[PDB]
Amino acid sequence: DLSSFIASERAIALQGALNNIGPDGSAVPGAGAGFVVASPSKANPDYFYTWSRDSALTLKMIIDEFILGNTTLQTIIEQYIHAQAVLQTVSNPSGTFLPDGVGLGEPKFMVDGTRFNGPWGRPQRDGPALRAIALMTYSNWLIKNGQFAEAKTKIWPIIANDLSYVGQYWNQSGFDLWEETYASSFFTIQNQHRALVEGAQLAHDLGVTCTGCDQAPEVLCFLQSFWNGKYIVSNINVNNGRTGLDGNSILGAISTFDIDAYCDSPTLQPCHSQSLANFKVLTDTFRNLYTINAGIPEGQGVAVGRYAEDVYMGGNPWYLITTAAAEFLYDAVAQWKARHVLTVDETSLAFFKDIYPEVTVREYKSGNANSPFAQIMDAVTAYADSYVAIAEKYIPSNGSLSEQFNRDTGTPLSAIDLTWSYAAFITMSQRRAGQYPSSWGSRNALPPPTTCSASSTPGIYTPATAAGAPNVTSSCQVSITFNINATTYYGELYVIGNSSDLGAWNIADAYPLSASAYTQDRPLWSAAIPLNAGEVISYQYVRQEDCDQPYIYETVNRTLTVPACGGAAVTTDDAWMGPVGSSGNC
Numbered sequence: 001d002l003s004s005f006i007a008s009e010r011a012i013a014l015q016g017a018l019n020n021i022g023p024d025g026s027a028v029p030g031a032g033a034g035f036v037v038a039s040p041s042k043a044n045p046d047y048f049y050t051w052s053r054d055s056a057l058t059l060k061m062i063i064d065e066f067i068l069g070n071t072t073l074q075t076i077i078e079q080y081i082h083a084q085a086v087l088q089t090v091s092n093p094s095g096t097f098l099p100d101g102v103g104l105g106e107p108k109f110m111v112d113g114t115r116f117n118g119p120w121g122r123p124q125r126d127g128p129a130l131r132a133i134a135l136m137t138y139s140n141w142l143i144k145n146g147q148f149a150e151a152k153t154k155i156w157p158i159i160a161n162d163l164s165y166v167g168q169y170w171n172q173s174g175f176d177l178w179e180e181t182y183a184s185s186f187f188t189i190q191n192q193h194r195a196l197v198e199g200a201q202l203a204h205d206l207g208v209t210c211t212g213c214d215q216a217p218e219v220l221c222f223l224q225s226f227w228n229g230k231y232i233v234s235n236i237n238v239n240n241g242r243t244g245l246d247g248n249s250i251l252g253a254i255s256t257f258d259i260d261a262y263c264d265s266p267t268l269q270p271c272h273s274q275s276l277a278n279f280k281v282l283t284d285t286f287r288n289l290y291t292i293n294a295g296i297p298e299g300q301g302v303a304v305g306r307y308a309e310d311v312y313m314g315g316n317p318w319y320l321i322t323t324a325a326a327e328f329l330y331d332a333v334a335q336w337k338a339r340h341v342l343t344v345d346e347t348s349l350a351f352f353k354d355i356y357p358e359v360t361v362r363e364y365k366s367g368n369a370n371s372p373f374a375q376i377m378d379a380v381t382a383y384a385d386s387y388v389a390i391a392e393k394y395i396p397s398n399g400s401l402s403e404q405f406n407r408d409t410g411t412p413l414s415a416i417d418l419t420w421s422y423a424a425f426i427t428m429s430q431r432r433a434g435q436y437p438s439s440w441g442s443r444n445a446l447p448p449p450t451t452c453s454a455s456s457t458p459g460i461y462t463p464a465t466a467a468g469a470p471n472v473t474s475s476c477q478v479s480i481t482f483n484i485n486a487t488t489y490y491g492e493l494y495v496i497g498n499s500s501d502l503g504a505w506n507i508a509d510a511y512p513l514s515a516s517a518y519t520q521d522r523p524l525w526s527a528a529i530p531l532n533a534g535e536v537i538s539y540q541y542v543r544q545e546d547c548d549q550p551y552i553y554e555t556v557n558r559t560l561t562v563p564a565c566g567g568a569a570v571t572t573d574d575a576w577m578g579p580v581g582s583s584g585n586c
């Protein structure tokens, strides 16, 4: 059946994703160490960059795939732990890492892990959640499989910063997952709820204090505001002229998936009534929008895009969203079987009447095979198959999943070999089988208070250190090269200043200059010093001497201010202003 030709595409998708990940990635030449590229397409659209969302979302698949079957994925997982451990410290246009921990929200870096200076929709506030959720789903396996040390000592201090970010900044606005609307997004809030609830449980079992986990009830309280009568508005707290119907909604449910949960829960699961009623109106608008969905019935899946007002490269359906729309049904079908009950609410009745004509407002219970409960279950999973069916049509023969496939003609376009779309296909294919990840602890989640309160506890941000080894003394240090004309020996002189990095007026901790390009023509000593930005550093060169002779300072103290964070790599040009004393002979 179709089961064969999606099992083959899953295997292609593994390589498609893995080839985009450095260092040993076939698709990406350049830059490695555990940084996942979204797409190798350097040609427009230029997607040759690492997105902290895409990186953390595709690696969540890799970890969950690693849990069942593949063990060679451990190599790329453990480089990612090193990668993001470093990436944390990288000062970027959103902000620096230390003082308030603002730089973690920056969505996009170079395939290196150097800053992306260009203009962008920042901050995005969801990467920290997905990166926490990724590392928490790996570290909670390590504690279960007799490697507690790694989870506690090295992986945790990465997570500690990322859910400190969520604790401190959930209630301030950001950009949505589509990098467009500067507003409180549903996908961003629902995933960063999970990062506190699941993060609190791992903090408990590791035996450490999660700063930021406090806000889990208040984040869940605010998540109730997104619902809107018939459907769920994805971006709340702005007016951008959009409906609110958005793939954002589906992608939030599938990425915050739990099997032990019931549809009663206020975390808004795939099987929850309001989420089903959204899926109806959301998929029905795309059923009517695109020419591809010309007269497809109400009981059959269709090409799903991101929103009705989408204009990005035509306003098309997306591969990752159309697969996630199937996964949404495969999540819901599993949850009803898991909890053995279907309380079909009148708010969610419009969903079921398409799939099963003779539904009511009953509590359908897990009875016989061929009973009504099983018939609804077998119809919903059949409805899920039609979403992957129409996906299989517009997926090409060689299996190259792009970002989008065209609105009208259905041929592929946009970024070629998108890592998300491969991962989203794998996440879907897992859920077709019984391969569900784990209970992140939705039942143990603290329910929302009586009234919501605007709040955010200020978390603290220590470097990962054990994972990746930056260890930052202070925020955004800029490079500055001292050069000095000093006539002396052609090889084998120091520099001190009022700053701590230089010395603070002592010659034991003074920085030694190298005589690399010293010549008769140009007697240059030099030293590239990474020291703090925005400081009027008062420096002075000094000469160390042979046969235990004392040090010889220059006659005057120089001062030149090092420029502010975010570039301007200055190089000073001084000469020796004082007497070069007596040389040695001993």
Ligand SMILES: *[C@@H]1O[C@H](CO)[C@@H](O[C@@H]2O[C@H](CO)[C@@H](O[C@@H]3O[C@H](CO)[C@@H](O)[C@H](O[C@H]4O[C@H](CO[C@H]5O[C@H](CO)[C@@H](O)[C@H](O)[C@@H]5O)[C@@H](O)[C@H](O)[C@@H]4O)[C@@H]3O)[C@H](O)[C@H]2NC(C)=O)[C@H](O)[C@H]1NC(C)=O
Pocket (backbone or CB within 6 Å): 170, 171, 172, 173, 184, 218, 221, 222, 225, 227, 228, 229, 233, 235, 236, 237, 238, 244, 452, 453, 454, 455
């Ligand atoms: C930080 O957290 C705090 C809470 O901890 C957040 O504060 C809450 O923000 C909510 C969203 O702005 C707000 O909800 C609305 O409150 C007003 C009254 O102030 C209600 O009238 C609204 O209900 C009505 O509208 C909804 C949706 O219908 C449409 O209309 C609204 C605009 O009115 C649109 O936003 C929406 O897109 C829809 O098109 C209906 O479903 C209702 O039936 C009703 O008609 C909302 O509930 C909370 O009141 C507010 N709470 C407090 C205590 O301040 C804060 O926003 C958050 N900030 C960030 C950045 O995350």
Ligand SMILES: C[C@H]1O[C@H](O[C@H]2[C@H](O)[C@@H](O)[C@@H](O[C@H]3[C@H](O)[C@@H](O)[C@@H](O)O[C@@H]3CO)O[C@@H]2CO)[C@H](O)[C@@H](O)[C@@H]1N[C@H]1C=C(CO)[C@@H](O)[C@H](O)[C@H]1O
Pocket (backbone or CB within 6 Å): 038, 047, 051, 053, 054, 119, 120, 121, 122, 177, 178, 179, 180, 312
């Ligand atoms: C890849 C991204 O492209 C689109 O958005 C970005 C634009 O391409 C850029 O031009 C830039 O826009 C800024 C203007 O240049 C600047 O003049 C100023 O007005 O600010 C603008 C931004 O506010 O940055 C845009 C992003 O903010 C497109 O709208 C967006 O959806 C695209 N993102 C997708 C790509 C990936 C790849 O990993 C996914 O992470 C996202 O979910 C996708 O939505």
Ligand SMILES: *[C@@H]1O[C@H](CO)[C@@H](O[C@@H]2O[C@H](CO)[C@@H](O)[C@H](O)[C@H]2NC(C)=O)[C@H](O)[C@H]1NC(C)=O
Pocket (backbone or CB within 6 Å): 011, 014, 015, 018, 069, 070, 072, 073
């Ligand atoms: C487990 O992961 C490995 C990658 O580490 C997969 O290996 C690829 O398998 C395909 C099979 O068609 C080959 O064509 C590739 O050449 C393999 N690549 C490498 C680098 O080994 C493997 O298929 C995965 N297995 C399962 C069961 O998921």
Ligand SMILES: *[C@@H]1O[C@H](CO)[C@@H](O[C@@H]2O[C@H](CO)[C@@H](O)[C@H](O)[C@H]2NC(C)=O)[C@H](O)[C@H]1NC(C)=O
Pocket (backbone or CB within 6 Å): 396, 398, 399, 400, 402, 412, 413, 414, 416
């Ligand atoms: C696999 O199929 C994809 C379908 O996208 C091929 O990508 C196209 O490659 C050609 C090369 O000339 C480009 O002109 C097209 O623009 C690409 N497609 C898109 C959507 O941009 C890919 O080359 C194929 N790989 C093979 C046959 O090895």
Ligand SMILES: *[C@@H]1O[C@H](CO)[C@@H](O[C@@H]2O[C@H](CO)[C@@H](O)[C@H](O)[C@H]2NC(C)=O)[C@H](O)[C@H]1NC(C)=O
Pocket (backbone or CB within 6 Å): 465, 471, 472, 473
């Ligand atoms: C990271 O660097 C700082 C200094 O920039 C180190 O801080 C010292 O920590 C030790 C205890 O481990 C204290 O006794 C010192 O007083 C601290 N300050 C200084 C200025 O030395 C810190 O230990 C480093 N961390 C790692 C893991 O190497």
Ligand SMILES: *[C@@H]1O[C@H](CO)[C@@H](O[C@@H]2O[C@H](CO)[C@@H](O)[C@H](O)[C@H]2NC(C)=O)[C@H](O)[C@H]1NC(C)=O
Pocket (backbone or CB within 6 Å): 485, 521, 522, 573, 574, 575
């Ligand atoms: C340090 O020595 C270098 C020697 O090159 C000086 O740089 C030269 O300065 C002269 C000024 O007459 C220029 O004509 C040359 O083109 C410069 N050469 C280079 C390589 O820069 C420099 O000015 C000296 N600095 C101080 C502070 O005395």
Ligand SMILES: *[C@@H]1O[C@H](CO)[C@@H](O)[C@H](O)[C@H]1NC(C)=O
Pocket (backbone or CB within 6 Å): 498, 499, 500, 536, 537, 538
């Ligand atoms: C270095 O000296 C300058 C003199 O203007 C001063 O402003 C600055 O604060 C000093 N920095 C120190 C002592 O770290």
Ligand SMILES: *[C@@H]1O[C@H](CO)[C@@H](O)[C@H](O)[C@H]1NC(C)=O
Pocket (backbone or CB within 6 Å): 498, 505, 538, 540, 553, 557
């Ligand atoms: C200037 O340098 C001398 C070196 O001995 C030092 O003692 C003095 O404190 C410095 N003064 C300033 C203002 O930098």
